[PDB]
């Protein structure tokens, strides 16, 4: 009876807040981790929402598993209203000439191929019912040049390419496909790097015109807006959630 959303992730950072936002809006939420040990955290991370959450172990770089997991979800729930491609990694070295090819391949595998696999199998099902929403997560580095994050940015550019291409291809099938482009977001990972003193909050906050960091809630709200049933006419679009970064 509830709309059903799959988030690649859900246990930390942006993904957890995305899960919470859909839960607060009466969705059934499928969340994932590579680690089966995370399933037991559910009643404690999402106190009152436990009954509306389903766990799946999933590595998005494993195409066969992506197909299996999405098939399982469709079989169990008989619907797949929304896919949120949250899973992503950033392996930041130094300048381009010092970067490791193994790092770039890992980012490609997770950020590009993982998003591609999830789209590919989600769309096979969404096509049949001529409805659904996909929201991909890019970055400001997906729309501009960012020193020391060139390779990550390249993958996030590629994500935008998958978003716009798929959008145009599936536009007449009533499926919406959009992306968000967050600026620097204060996740748990960043908060502890600030708390360990070796990273000044104001130092990184200053790259945004708004002179503050983004929150996981800022991102979750944008994703929810693009995904919900009241989105009838927005597709192929990249929503910047960046404190004004891309406008200068």
Ligand X SMILES: NC(=O)c1ccc[n+]([C@@H]2O[C@H](COP(=O)([O-])OP(=O)(O)OC[C@H]3O[C@@H](n4cnc5c(N)ncnc54)[C@H](OP(=O)(O)O)[C@@H]3O)[C@@H](O)[C@H]2O)c1
Angstrom CA distances, 220 to 4, 75, 169, stand at 16, 27, 26
| Positions of chain breaks in the chain, given as the residue before each break (C to N > 2.5 Å) | none
Closer to ligand X by Cβ: residue 128 or 161: 161
Catalytic residues: 152
Which of 129, 115, 108, 103 has the alpha carbon at shortest distance from 3?
A: 129
Closer to ligand X by Cβ: residue 214 or 236: 214
Give the nearest distance from C-beta 73 to a second copy in angstroms.
Answer: 26
Q: 3-state class of 5 per DSSP?
A: strand
Give the nearest distance from C-beta 236 to a second copy in angstroms.
Answer: 2
Is 31 annotated as ligand-binding? Answer: no
Closer to ligand X by Cβ: residue 49 or 56: 56
Q: Which of 4, 5, 6, 9 binds ligand X (CB under 6 A)?
A: 9
Give the nearest distance from C-beta 133 to a second copy in angstroms.
Answer: 13
- H/E segment holding residue 165: helix 150-170
Give the up-direction half-sphere exposure of residue 167: CA atoms within 13 A in the CB hemisphere: 21
Subset of 71-110 contacting ligand X (CB under 6 A):
86-90, 110
Got the DSSP string for 177-200?
Answer: EEEEEE-SB--HHHHHHHHTSSS-
Q: Judge contact between 172 and 166, C-beta under 8 A.
A: no
Q: Which stretch binds a second copy (CB under 8 A): 64-72, 142-150, 190-198, 208-216?
A: 208-216
Q: Give me the 142-181 binding string for ligand X, x by CB under 6 A, dash otherwise.
A: ----------------------------------------
Closer to ligand X by Cβ: residue 16 or 176: 16
Is 34 annotated as ligand-binding? Answer: yes
Which of 111, 102, 106, 182 has the alpha carbon at shortest distance from 144?
A: 182
CA distance 202 to 117: 38
Q: Does 183 engage in binding with a second copy (CB under 8 A)?
A: yes
Give the footprint of a second copy on this chain (CB under 8 A): 164, 167-168, 171-172, 174, 183, 208-212, 214-215, 217-218, 221-222, 225, 230-237, 239-244, 246-248
């Amino acid at each position: 009876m509830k709309k059903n959303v799959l988030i690649t992730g859900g246990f930390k950072g942006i993904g957890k807040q995305v899960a919470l936002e859909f839960l607060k809006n009466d969705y059934h939420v499928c969340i994932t981790s590579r680690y089966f040990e995370k399933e037991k955290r559910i009643p404690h991370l999402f106190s009152s929402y436990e009954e509306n959450i389903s766990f799946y172990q999933l590595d998005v770089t494993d195409e066969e598993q992506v197909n299996e997991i999405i098939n399982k979800i469709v079989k169990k729930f008989g619907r797949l209203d929304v896919l949120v491609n949250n899973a992503g990694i950033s392996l930041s070295d130094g300048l381009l000439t010092e970067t490791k090819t193994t790092d770039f391949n890992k980012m490609i595998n997770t950020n590009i191929l993982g998003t591609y696999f999830c789209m590919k199998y989600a769309l096979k099902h969404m096509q049949k019912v001529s409805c659904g929403a996909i929201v991909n997560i890019s970055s400001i580095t997906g729309l501009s040049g960012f020193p020391y994050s060139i390779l990550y940015g390249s993958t996030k550019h590629a994500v935008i390419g998958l978003t716009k291409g798929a959008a145009v291809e599936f536009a007449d099938k009533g499926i919406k496909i959009n992306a968000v482009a967050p600026g620097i977001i204060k996740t748990e990972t960043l908060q502890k790097e600030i708390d360990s003193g070796e990273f000044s909050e104001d130092s990184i906050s200053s790259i945004h015109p708004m002179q503050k960091l983004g929150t996981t809630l800022d991102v979750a709200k944008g994703i929810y807006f693009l995904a919900n049933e009241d989105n009838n006419f927005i597709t192929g679009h990249v929503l910047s959630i960046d404190g004004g970064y891309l406008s200068q």
